[PDB]
Every structure is written in structure tokens, then in C-alpha cells.
Amino acid sequence: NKQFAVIGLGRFGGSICKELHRMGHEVLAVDINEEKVNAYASYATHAVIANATEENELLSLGIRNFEYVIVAIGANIQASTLTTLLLKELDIPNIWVKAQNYYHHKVLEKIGADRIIHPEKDMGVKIAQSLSDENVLNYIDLSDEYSIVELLATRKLDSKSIIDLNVRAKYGCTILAIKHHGDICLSPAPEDIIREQDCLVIMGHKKDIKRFENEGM
Amino acid sequence: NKQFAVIGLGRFGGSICKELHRMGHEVLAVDINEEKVNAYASYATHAVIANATEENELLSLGIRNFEYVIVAIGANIQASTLTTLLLKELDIPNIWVKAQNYYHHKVLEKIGADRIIHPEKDMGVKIAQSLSDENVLNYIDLSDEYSIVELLATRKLDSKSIIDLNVRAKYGCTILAIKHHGDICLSPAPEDIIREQDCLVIMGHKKDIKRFENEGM
Amino acid sequence: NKQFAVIGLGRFGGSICKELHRMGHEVLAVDINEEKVNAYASYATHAVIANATEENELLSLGIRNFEYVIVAIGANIQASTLTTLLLKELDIPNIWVKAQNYYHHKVLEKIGADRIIHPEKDMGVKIAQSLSDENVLNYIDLSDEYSIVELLATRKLDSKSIIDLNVRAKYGCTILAIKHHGDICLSPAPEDIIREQDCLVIMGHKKDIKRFENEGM
Amino acid sequence: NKQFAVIGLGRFGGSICKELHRMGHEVLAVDINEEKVNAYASYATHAVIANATEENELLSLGIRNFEYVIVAIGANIQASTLTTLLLKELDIPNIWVKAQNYYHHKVLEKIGADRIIHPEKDMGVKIAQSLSDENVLNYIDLSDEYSIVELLATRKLDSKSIIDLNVRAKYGCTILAIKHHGDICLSPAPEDIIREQDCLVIMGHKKDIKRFENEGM
Amino acid sequence: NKQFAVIGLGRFGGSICKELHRMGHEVLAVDINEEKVNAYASYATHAVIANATEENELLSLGIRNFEYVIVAIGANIQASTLTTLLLKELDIPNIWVKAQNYYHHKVLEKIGADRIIHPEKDMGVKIAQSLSDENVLNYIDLSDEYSIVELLATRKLDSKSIIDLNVRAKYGCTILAIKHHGDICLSPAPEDIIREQDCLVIMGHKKDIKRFENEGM
Amino acid sequence: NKQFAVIGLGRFGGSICKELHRMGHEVLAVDINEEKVNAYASYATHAVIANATEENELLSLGIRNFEYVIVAIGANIQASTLTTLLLKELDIPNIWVKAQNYYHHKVLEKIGADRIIHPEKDMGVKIAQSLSDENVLNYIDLSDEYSIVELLATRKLDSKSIIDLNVRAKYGCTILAIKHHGDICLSPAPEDIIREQDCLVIMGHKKDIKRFENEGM
Amino acid sequence: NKQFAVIGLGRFGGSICKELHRMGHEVLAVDINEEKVNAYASYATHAVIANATEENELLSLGIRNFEYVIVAIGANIQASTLTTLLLKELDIPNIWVKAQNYYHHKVLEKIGADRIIHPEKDMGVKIAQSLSDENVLNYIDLSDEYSIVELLATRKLDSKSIIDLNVRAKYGCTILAIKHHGDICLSPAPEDIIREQDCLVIMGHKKDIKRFENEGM
Amino acid sequence: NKQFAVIGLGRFGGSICKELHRMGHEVLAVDINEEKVNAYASYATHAVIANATEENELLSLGIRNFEYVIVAIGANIQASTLTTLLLKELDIPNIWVKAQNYYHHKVLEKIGADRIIHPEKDMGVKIAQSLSDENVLNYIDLSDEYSIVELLATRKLDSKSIIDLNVRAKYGCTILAIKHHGDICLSPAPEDIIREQDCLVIMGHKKDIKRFENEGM
């Protein structure tokens, strides 16, 4: 019953479509280029060649049978803009659009895009964070000051316990998860040790985590 | 600090350069497009116009002394491949490369790319997960089975204590954080309550977290 | 006098610029085409080569201080849209935009265009009205029902007085003006006569005016 | 019986065709681009894909069954020129052609075009008139010195009568129409009042109308 | 001598310019192609780079004072037409124009071209006449019926006197000239003989000349 | 039986083909562009779409059933060169080729072209001769020193006889033909007169003809 | 049974395919351009139009029934690179690839190309050797110091024996073959003579051969 | 030394230039591509940017004094042909030309090319011979029947003497050289043995050599 349409098969849009189909959902792959439709037809419940900037073709797809629509056109600003305008004028509930710059974001905001995504920009900032800090594998920001960070275990952390490396007192951070040799310990007891090259999931303020990385690692 | 060289100022590479310079790192912005080098001039230490595939221009850039080199050319496969093979011939320790498809990733593997990144693919996976479940704001996967997940609160959770929603034994998860009205509570107590439209950071197995999303949300 | 800035010197925009400068107004002629800026140089106060979609060039033009800004780019939808959104971000009070189709008009509505113009459409309507009825030279519509209409005289009207063609009671209209042999009579008397190939300015309901065109012409 | 052919479907030509069809006439939409024919087929009694610069195709349309022919090609000077030459050499009674510049007008004049239209230029001068004079909504020029002008009612005109604002004596102009809240009074008696934001249709010399606008408004 | 201006240095126009300068005439070689103006520089009095369709450049060339202006642009119809209409607006007495097809010839007729030339067409007619009859070297048509024709001699004419081949009464023609071994005899006598592979200039009706070509050759 | 093939339908080639067909011959029109074949099919005994630079297509036309072949490709040097090489390697008796420059002539000479034609160049020199000498309508060169010239009769020649204007004694030229009001007198008697605007066909040395034009005209 | 696939029909690849077919082998000609397939279909046991950079098409050809595969694409570096990567990932035993530069060679080496060929470069060095030494017809290098060289017999060598021109003692080289008037003597006895313009196949160190050429020739 | 001029720096021509300069010859590297002239600057005596088809630039290069001129343009047939005809018109003694197909070779034959080379074709023949027989490393053909061939040794030949493999009488060939472990033995004795993975230089009839390859290898 729940229906997703993915217009603009690219890296972002193709990933969205393939992942939504893998999850067992109803997805329609839409693209103006025939080769992209041929490539993503195996990964969609239905795939059509449609110039989504044309109205008639959009109505022929039955764009109104879809609860969610994702305009993944991010390089052609005019195409994405007028596709989103068409979709909003056809009373589509949820419209998520890939953006290209701040001004494309402003245009999509003014025309009524329900969600605007900047994939390359967010990945750029995350990869820069992992770049300057070689210890960070991944993280998630709780706010402008707090976050949960996954770290690669260290020369200094090898064979040390959670009270030997106390963080709730020495840094104000909380030990959260340990990953060793494929196994994963959640909410670990104060007796658990950490070996080198393990995955340490910690949580707290960014500055305290950086201080732990500088002194405790 | 450190020495980063961002070849190919795109959305991804430009975000990398801007974020790295915001954190005060020496970042060399390299591109072939004059307007691209003009766009990130104030957002980098040195912004030079140069063709990265030419060995003479790479020697002119002094690229052999940089510790970190990130090429962000994804659409142009030949340029990215030859630039990566060049930098590897110049014996660069850290080479991070943005890829476009599986075969580009494999050809970067064979020529010695240190870290290959697929930004749009991972972001599409994340946004598709957020699309299938509107409650999920952000998340991070500890493995192929356990994750830390951020949720948006529901009318079904307004003014309900943490002990009322026992997640340690009813589902085997752990509530981690409560963001409310711009403030944030880390590692809360069983007596703290939940209002609607709050940010709930939980941690546990994916299936158990979604079981909560079904039963209690 | 006033401050007008005509971005996009086209046929429409070039006519605007030429006419406004003929009446002695400070008009800034802005275009990307060097030959276009060279064409209207003597027909404007300042004629500058600049890309209107670039924010830096718009700041260089001092466009933030102008009271009236008219962008005449119709064919290029993306350039017109981003220029309009730019000028609105710069808080311009009066933004007049030339449009190309309905969706361009809507996207200009959503980004805050002050007045959207469709020159070719309205002129086509007028010329089609003049085509269906060869008697109509020009006209202006007071509403969707009443108009002031200019006619070319017919052999059926040579040397016939205004009282002979009673239009106030026979059709409910009013004869307004009589152009003859380069001279012009405004608000004529019932004793003035009509010769053929004269300009007859009448006013009234469209259906009644055409009823006259049928019966008396 | 009366037949119109509209060659050159653009903004101007498309408007002409759609308006002529709305009026209940026989129109044939001709265009070299298939998409334009597909778009305007719903708005024409018949629509064909024809390269109107080719003779054979023009004869195949039966261009001789048409009393009126409108060459709305205004960007390609050679195409419009040779289409008009073909049409005049095929003994078409009325040929109306959209022009682009003064020299295209001269060429069409020399080859025998029955009417030459400059839509963008006329709209440019009219919009410039409405630009410098913010009170003018629309107008119609009776001669180089006299015209009928429609104006937006003023702060000063609110709740004032036609003898309180005497124009036949104080300015030499004639009150002609009033439009208030959707209703429209024609040839109004001296007792009618005028409220703010009403539409005031006046008629007279341009200088007297401007003096009224300066002092009386 | 005289003032010629060859606009559009092509094969035809370049030949005109080269031959006219060889005979010592002031010839202005005008073209848009820089290499074309460089090619005929030593073969003209003045060779200037200029766009002929621009009125300002034509005024810069001082083209209004030239007595003879020959535009040789044939492929580009619009450029040739506008250049011709320009030069006619500048009141040039002698305007010679190279045409490409019948409609280009007609549009040059209507805009006032003084002499329209079709070089390739006439040369094709001449070469086709020489192809149908290998005896014909060159010819000139006095009318649609009588011509002066040059023939190549045949074994059937070696050492035969002019009185032996009576052409004044047997066919009604006149033998005019005998070219033999680099020498040439004008208006020969009945006693002069003919050798093979000579140039025989005859004059008369086409049918009678070909009757000779059949019977005596 | 006699067969002509015309490859390269242009102005020159199209004229050759149309004139050869008008003469009642067997012509095959060959062109790579489909529109040219469609245009010249009505003027050829057979017309085909063939890329004449391909061998297989040439053999499929039966290029060997043709005694004469005319490569009228004059703008593409490589196409004409390799078509002529193919034709000579297929043992075609007579190959006549349109040339473009002296070096193309040399190439066609070396590869074995039977005849090389420079139509535009010859017409250029002839039109230049008619340009500098406004009296010359047409002519034919007998040698480097002698020629027959057709002239427009003169103010001075009006109503004068052939002995009154003696040329065999005063100039060494021979009176040859007179054309008056459509009639044409050949080999005229010494009593024939010449009126103004008549056509005077004279024959002799170029210098004597020029002296006659200067003094006798 | 033995199967060769030749992808990339060019001069090199076309020669490989035609020669392999002449030898009586099983060859499949693959090319993205239809005309190349049409040209080489007569010279291959099977020829198909296939975009070899696409996987699906490669599997459809049955690229796995081929023991040898030759990627003769040498101008498009990306196409050849990704075709070779596909072929190696499909477990093709022998992959021989035409290269373009040293860096393309390095890429093909890293991705696992079984053989890399530089045809133009090797022919360039061989033709340069024959250029500076006009006596060398062909040769074969045994090592960096020894080679067998074929030479054109000399003015000095005419009618001289193998002991009269002793090379095993005077130069350290070995006489190997003589070719005279089409006949060829192998391992010749000490009595054989050598005439001028014969072919002399000698073998030894490069320096001794050059000394023989300088003094003995 | 000598004077070589390499026009058209390609893979073949660039290899020629590099090898000839390595051997210390005055080589003029001529190309139209600026980057190509910049690439071989250090690998030539003089590297000049020039269009070879322009006669003026060829005179500027002083090409008329060079003894050897090698044009390596193969893809561009017209440029190569006109350059060759130019250099032949300048009476160059030695003109070597790279060809692309048979007809290009013939047109170079007809215009007087001294030596025409087909590098890719001959290399394809050689590599196809090495493909049909993996034992063949290199070879040189003494005629259409006898060759000197280099083989890779087989397990079937390890530690077998030359007299054990009698090739003079069993097959009529002669073993010439044995390369082993970087050393090389010329004209070996019957007592020398053969190890596997050695280079065996043999000489004789092709059929007899392959008979050995079958029976003894």
C-alpha cells in the first residue's frame, strides 16, 4: 500500500531505490535516460522511462498513487526545481529532494519541498572529521555540543579495563560499547577489558572526547 | 597541524575542504575549473589551478610532500584513476578517493587507493532507512545487527517515565539521551519523562528497536 | 528621477531600457552577452557586462540600492529564477520578471517576484482579436465584459452623423473619438460626421460593440 | 470557411493559436518541432509537424485553403523570411509575421508581408510607461498627443466626486469610467464618487493626464 | 580606375578579387574569417577583417563611398540578404550578389540587388553541354537559338579545305577561326585546310552546328 | 546506352544533373544526404542515397555501367579525393571532378582524374571582366591574345552602319553579329545599322576590342 | 576449440582479427561501432555489435567461451581499462591489451593484464633504426648487445665471396643468409658470392655490425 | 649526422622522434597540438608548433632543406595527403608517410611518397602469430617461406644437447643462439645443452620450424 517513487536515478537516487527495494517496499524507478532505467529495473518493483519534467508523463505513471516521492536530480537545477513544483502542484504528501547548493535549497524551500537533502556535503564534513581525527570511525551528533563517537582501539588502550580507563570521572564521558574480533558487548560491566584494534563506542561532549583521544589514547 | 590536499573541488570535495579549513588545517584546494578554485579561495590555505592528471603540474604543486591527499573526482573515472595512480607512484602515504561505481572502486583497489568512499550510496541507504520509518532521525550501525538510533517522539509517549517504558528487559535495548526544547539530557534516570516531538537516543539490536517502535510508539 | 535596472537585454528588456532612457531615467543595462551590452550602450545610463546569477557580480553592480529591478530573461528559466531569488534575498522592493510558461510564473510567484509579465501571450491575444475582426485596430479591456475599442471606418459609414448612428440607446455604447486625416476630435458632438478609413474610438460592452460592428459597419 | 494558419508555435504564435481556437475559429498549428505540435494539438482544430520553410510540405498542408497566415517565427530570421516569401509566392491574401529587429521588418516589407508585428518591443514600451508611472495600469494611444489611460485610484482621490475632482475645467481631460469592488460605472454622472484603489479610466492629452497625476493624485 | 568591394572572399569572390587586382583596380577584400583575409592580402588593395552584417563595421569600412560592391556569400543566405539590404540602405549604385537557390534570388530581387549571379549553375550547364558532346570545347549563346561554338578536330577532318566543308550553304553556319599548334588564324579563307586536334571556332544555329558535328565530324 | 553518373549533388553537381536530364540523357543522381536525393529525384532518370566514399555502395549502384562519372564534391577534399581514387581503381573511362584549390587539382591530377573543373574561379574571372568593363555582356577567349566579345550597344553606336563604324580598317576587328529587339542578324552586310542597347558580337585581339570600346564607344 | 576474441576493431585490432582468421582460427570481432563490425564481418568467423565496456553484453557474447581475449582499444584509456577489468573479473585466462602510454601500461599491469603491447612505439623505434641506417631492412634483437640484421647489399659487396668478406675474423659476425633474385641461400658455404642489391642476413653484436656497415659497406 | 623532420607527433611519430634523438640526430618535431610539442621538447633538437598543411608555415620551418621527412599522421587522411604532396612539391628526397588504410596508401603512392609504413597492421600480424603459437617470442621473415624465429623453451627440452636435437637433417633448420639467465651464446656447438624458459633462436623454413615445435617441444 505504501508507495515510493524515486525520480532521478543517479548514485544517490539509485542507492535510495535499490535500498528501498531491498527492504521489501514498493518502489518505482523513473529516469529520462533509457540505460539508467534498464540498469535499475532489476532493483525496482517497476521501472519506466519518463521525462519527469513533463506533466503528461508524470500523470501517466500515476504519480498520485505514491505517498512518497524523491526527486534525486541534483545536477540539473531547473529539472529538479520544475519536477518538484509539478509534484507539489499535484498534491503529493511527502517530497524529498536532493539539493546542489544553498540557493537550490532556498528555491526548493520556497516552492514547498517537504525535505531537502545535501548528501555530498554531509559526507564531506563527516569524512573531514574522520580525516583530521584518524581515530574516529563513525559518530552521531546529539547536539552542537554532545555526540556519540565510535573509535578504533589504541596502542595505549590494549588490555585495559573500563575502570582502569575511567571516563565518567576522568573525562565526563560514558563507555557504551566494545567490539572485539566480531563480537559486540553492549552496556559493558566495569570489568570488561579492551584490546587493541577493537571498536570503542563512547558518548559525551565533543571536547571531553577529544581530550580522551589526546591523553587517554 | 597536518597537510591535506583536496583534488577535485566538487560538492563532496568542496565540503571536505571547507570543513577541514574551518577546523584550521592546511588544505590545498586543487581543481581544473578556474571558477571552482575561485569559489573556495577564502575557504582554504592555498587554492591553485592545476590539472591533476599531469605529472609535471603535480610536481609543481609539491604534492609529493603532502601526508593526506583526497581526490573527489567521481564522475570522471579516467581522471580519478590516473590521478590516484600518479599520487601512488609519488609514494603518498594516505590516498582517499571518491568512487562512482563498483568497477571504479575495484580499479582504485588495484592501483593502491588507501581509502575509497561512496558518499551518495551510503547517504541513500541512510535516507531510505529514514523513509521506511519516519521515526528515525539519525542512526549509526555498531555492526550488521546492533545500532544506536535517534527517534522522534510520538503522542503515544508524552509524559511517560523511562521506567514506565522498560527497554532493558522488555526489548533488551537502552535509552541513551533525551533532547527536549534545545536542552539535552545524557544517560538519563528512570524517573525522567518523555514529551512529544523530542529526540530519543536509544541503543540496541535493530529488530528490538523496531519492536519498540511498533509497540510503544 | 528613479533607479531602474534592466537585467537581460532582450527584445522585451531592450525595449524597456530604450524607452525608459528616452524618458530620462537612470537605467542600468545588464547582460552577459558583450555585444548586447554594446548594442544598448548609448541607450542607457550605465551598461555593464555581468552575470546576474553570480551574487558577487550583483554586489559589484551595487544592485542592492536600486528601487526597480526588471529581469527580462524568459527562455532561460534557471537563470531568471536564480536572479529573481537573488534580488529578493537582497531585499529589492520592486522586482518585475518576464516569464515564459505557467510553471515559470508559479516558481516566480513562490520566490517572491513582485510583478510577472507575459508579453508575447498578451500580444498574441490582442493580435488574434484583431485577426478575427479586421475592424479592430486597438483596444483596452475595462473588465471581462466592457472595453474601449478603436475601429477602422467602412464604406457603410462615410458621411454619416453621430446622431444618425445612435450608440447610446441602440446599443448602449458611447463614441469617444474621431481621428481623420492626421487630426483628432475628442468627445465629439452628435453633428460631427464620419468618413471612411477613419479611427473611431468607441466604448461599451464587447457584445454591444460587436453588434454595432455587424449592423452598422 | 474562414481559415487561419499559425506557423511558428512559440509564446507569441502559441498564444495566437490558442486564442483563435478559443474564439471558435478554424486554426492549423504548424511547427517543425514535434513536441510543440504535440503540446498545441489540444488547442488547435488541426495540428501537423511541418517544416514550413520547405515548399512541398506547405503545399501538402494545403496552405492555399487558408485566408490568413501568421508566421510567428521571430528568432530565426532566415526561416521566417523564406517562409514569408513562399507564402507570398503562393498567393496567400493576408500574411502577418512576427519580427525581430528593424532590418527583419525591412526585409519582410520588401518581400511583401501584409502585417509586421513587434510584440516584445510594444510590451516593453508599455511596461516602461507603467514602470515610470506607477499609477498607470493600462492605456491606449489615440495619437502622438492624445490617449485614454486607466489609473489606480489614489490616497487623494478617496471618497471624492467627479465635480469635486473636475477635470474638464481644471485639466481639459474627460472622466470616462469608474471601477469599484468589481462593479463598473460607464459614462458616470457628475455625482458619482471614487474610492481608493478603484480603477479610473480618463481620456485626454498626455501632458494634462500627467499634470492630473502630479497635482490631483 | 574604379572602386570595387568584394565582400565574402570565397572561391567565386576570391577569384573576382584576384582577377580585379591583377588588372590594377582598387579592390577591398572583406571577410569575417581571419585566414581568408590573410590569404588574399597580397591580391588586393585593402584587406580588412569585418562582419558585413554589422552596420557599424560597414560604416567603418567606408562602404558608402564605393561604386561597386560584390557580395559573394552564397551558402549563408541570411548574411548575404542582410548585407545586400544594408548596402542598398546605404544607397550603393552597383550591388552584385552571388545567390544559392531560386528563393535566395527572389529575396535579393525584392530587396534591390542590382545583379544576381549563379556561377555554379551556369558552369554546370556549360560542362553538361560539353559532356553530351565531346567535340565542344567552349561556346557562347547569342540567343536561345544561335551560338558561337568551339570544336576539337576529328580524324574525319584532317587536311580538308574550308571550301570542301561548305558551311555557309550546306548548314547555314560560318567558320570563324582555326587554332593550330599554338598559332591562330582569324576569319580564314576557303583555301585554308584543317588538321586533327585543332580548335575550330564556328558560328550559327545550334541545330545546324550539331548537324555538322554529325555529318562532317 | 550512354550513361552519366553525377556524384555530389550541390549547386554545380545539381545543375549538371538537371541539365543532363533536360537534354534527354541517362543520369543517376548520387548523394549522401537524403534530402538532396529527394530534391533531385524528380530531375534524374534515377536517384539513390549512397555514400560514394564507400566502395560497397558504389558497386551496388553499378558504377561500372556508367561511361561518364562526375564527382561534384568540391568542399570536402578527402571525400572527393577518395571517391575519385575509387572510380579510377574501378576502371571508369571518363572522370570529371569539381576542384576547390590548386592543391586539390594537383591531387586529382596525380590520382588520374580525366578532367578537373574550377567553376567558381572561372565565373569569378568572367564576372570581373564584365565588372571592370561594363560594356561586356559575355565573351569567349580564342587564345591568350584573341577573343570574341558580346557588347551592349552604346550612346555613340546608335543608328550607325557597319561601314560608318568600320572595324576591319580602323581597329582590325570583325563585325560578327547584331541583336535588335529580339531578332538576330548573322554575318551582317556592310549596310546593316546598329541601334542603342543592341547586342554587338565582335571578334579580334583583346587590345583592339578595348581600343574600340574606348574610342568607338 | 581454441577461441580468440578481438575487442576493439582498429588498425591493430583489425589486423590481429584478419590475420588470426587467415591462419584458420576461431575469431570473434567485437566493436561498438556498427560500421567496423560490418567491415570486419567478412574477415571473422563471427562478428557482433557489442559495447564491450558493458557487462551484460559481454556475457551475452559468451566471453567465457574464449581462451584468449585481445582488448585492442588503445585511444580510449577508460574503455580499455574497464573492459580489461571486466575480463579479468570474469576469469579469462589470457588477456592481451593494446596500450597508449606508460601510465596506461601501469594501470593494465595493476589490474592484471596478461600481456601489454605497444605497437606504434616498437614500430617507431624500428623505423628510426632503419632511418638512421639506410642499409637495414629489418632486424631482431637477441639481447641488449646482440642481434640479427638483414641488410641491402652494397656497391662494395658486389660479386664478393664470404671469405673475401670474412666477418668471423675481421668483425666477429657470422654470415647467415643470402637472397638473390628471389632465391634464398641458407647457411651458405664459404664459396658463395654476393651481388649488389641482394639481401644479406648477418648476426652478431650491434657494434661489430655497425663497423662492418661503415668499413665493409 | 643527418636531418630528420618528424611531422605529426603521435605514438608512432613520437617514438620515431624519441629514438632518433636518443641516437643523437638532428630531429625537428612538428605538430599542431601545443601540448604535443611541449611533450617532446626535451626529446628533440627543435620542437616547433606549425600546421604542416600550410605552405607558408612549411617554408617558415625551412623544411625544403631537410633530407628526411617523416609524416606520422594516420587518422587524418586529408592532412597527411596534402602534407605529403606539399613536401614532394618542395622536392624532398626522402618522404616517409604513415598510412591508415589501403586507399590512403594508394593515394600516397600516386602523389610520390617515398616509403609508406603500416605499423599497426604489421604489429598485429606479428602478435597474431605469437598468439597462435605461444612458443614464438619474436621472429623475422627472410621471405614468404623462410624465417629466423625465437622460441621459449619447454619442459620437453630441459638439459638436452644440441646434437640430441639434430635440426640440420631431421628438419633442415639451424639453431642459432641460446639465451639463458641473462647471458647469451651465439652460434652454439653440438655439446651445449638447453634448459627450460630459455630463448632459442633458430632459422629455417616456417613449416619445418613448426614441425620441430610440434615434435620436439
Ligand SMILES: Nc1ncnc2c1ncn2[C@@H]1O[C@H](COP(=O)(O)OP(=O)(O)OP(=O)(O)O)[C@@H](O)[C@H]1O
Ligand atoms: N526530467 C528529467 N530531467 C533531468 N534528469 C532526469 C529527468 N528524469 C530523470 N532524470 C535523471 O536524473 C538523474 C540526475 O542525475 P544528475 O547527474 O543530474 O545529478 P547528480 O546530483 O550529479 O547525481 P548523483 O545522484 O549521482 O549525485 C540523471 O540520471 C537523469 O537521467
Ligand SMILES: Nc1ncnc2c1ncn2[C@@H]1O[C@H](COP(=O)(O)OP(=O)(O)OP(=O)(O)O)[C@@H](O)[C@H]1O
Ligand atoms: N583532472 C582534474 N584535475 C583537477 N580537477 C579536476 C580534474 N577532473 C575533474 N576535476 C574537478 O573535480 C570536481 C568534481 O568532478 P566531477 O564533476 O567529475 O565529480 P562528481 O563526483 O560528479 O561531483 P560531486 O563531488 O559534486 O558528487 C570538479 O570541480 C572538476 O573541475
Ligand SMILES: Nc1ncnc2c1ncn2[C@@H]1O[C@H](COP(=O)(O)OP(=O)(O)OP(=O)(O)O)[C@@H](O)[C@H]1O
Ligand atoms: N545570467 C544572465 N545574466 C545576464 N544576462 C543574461 C543572463 N541570462 C541571459 N541573459 C541575457 O538575457 C537576454 C534575453 O535572454 P533570452 O534569450 O533567454 O530571452 P527571451 O525571453 O527568449 O528573449 P526576448 O526578450 O527577445 O523575448 C539576452 O541578451 C541574454 O544575454
Ligand SMILES: Nc1ncnc2c1ncn2[C@@H]1O[C@H](COP(=O)(O)OP(=O)(O)OP(=O)(O)O)[C@@H](O)[C@H]1O
Ligand atoms: N520551418 C521552420 N523553421 C524554423 N522554425 C520553425 C519552422 N516551422 C516551425 N518552426 C517553429 O517556429 C518557432 C519559432 O520560435 P523561435 O524560438 O524561433 O522564436 P522567438 O521569436 O524567440 O519566439 P516567441 O514567439 O516565443 O517570442 C519554433 O518553435 C520552431 O520550432
Ligand SMILES: Nc1ncnc2c1ncn2[C@@H]1O[C@H](COP(=O)(O)OP(=O)(O)OP(=O)(O)O)[C@@H](O)[C@H]1O
Ligand atoms: N557576414 C559576413 N561578413 C563577411 N564575410 C562573410 C560573412 N559571411 C560569410 N562570409 C565569408 O564569405 C565567404 C564565402 O561564404 P560561403 O562559404 O557561405 O560561400 P559559398 O557560396 O558556399 O562559397 P564559394 O564562393 O566558394 O562558392 C567566406 O570566406 C566567409 O568567411
Ligand SMILES: Nc1ncnc2c1ncn2[C@@H]1O[C@H](COP(=O)(O)OP(=O)(O)OP(=O)(O)O)[C@@H](O)[C@H]1O
Ligand atoms: N560520400 C560523400 N561524401 C561527401 N559528400 C557527399 C558524398 N556523397 C555525396 N555527397 C554530397 O556531395 C555534395 C558536395 O557539396 P559540398 O557542399 O561539399 O561542395 P561545394 O563545392 O561547396 O558545392 P557546390 O557544388 O554547390 O559548389 C554534398 O551535397 C554532399 O551531400
Ligand SMILES: Nc1ncnc2c1ncn2[C@@H]1O[C@H](COP(=O)(O)OP(=O)(O)OP(=O)(O)O)[C@@H](O)[C@H]1O
Ligand atoms: N566498449 C567500447 N568502448 C570503446 N571503443 C570500443 C568499444 N567496443 C569496441 N570499441 C572499438 O574499439 C576501437 C578502438 O580504436 P581507437 O580509435 O579507440 O584506438 P587506437 O589505438 O587509436 O586505434 P588503432 O588500433 O588503429 O591504433 C574503436 O574502433 C571502437 O569502436
Ligand SMILES: Nc1ncnc2c1ncn2[C@@H]1O[C@H](COP(=O)(O)OP(=O)(O)OP(=O)(O)O)[C@@H](O)[C@H]1O
Ligand atoms: N596538419 C597537421 N600539422 C601538424 N601536426 C598534425 C597535423 N595533423 C595532425 N597532426 C598531429 O599528428 C599527430 C598524430 O595524428 P593522428 O591522431 O591523426 O594520428 P594516428 O595515426 O591516429 O596516431 P598514432 O601515431 O598514435 O597511431 C597528432 O599529434 C596531431 O596533432
Ligand code: NA
Ligand atoms: Na554527487
Ligand code: NA
Ligand atoms: Na520573445
Ligand code: NA
Ligand atoms: Na561553390
Ligand code: NA
Ligand atoms: Na595507432
